[PDB]
Amino acid sequence: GFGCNGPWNEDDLRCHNHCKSIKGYKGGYCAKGGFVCKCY
């Protein structure tokens, strides 16, 4: 989710922005073929 909807729809920037918008995270990326929006 959050941009990462699979390799056919991978909005890594959208995941990144989401995660970065959350206090406690610097950013985020689409993992697992682009399915899982993982924050860091």
Side-chain angles (χ1 to χ4, degrees):
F2 301 102
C4 321
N5 295 271
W8 52 77
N9 184 27
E10 179 191 76
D11 205 310
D12 184 89
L13 183 66
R14 179 173 176 197
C15 177
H16 186 98
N17 279 332
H18 173 68
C19 293
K20 186 177 66 63
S21 302
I22 301 173
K23 191 176 68 184
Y25 295 113
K26 300 171 58 177
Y29 62 97
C30 296
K32 183 64 176 301
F35 281 105
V36 185
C37 179
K38 295 190 176 180
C39 303
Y40 61 86

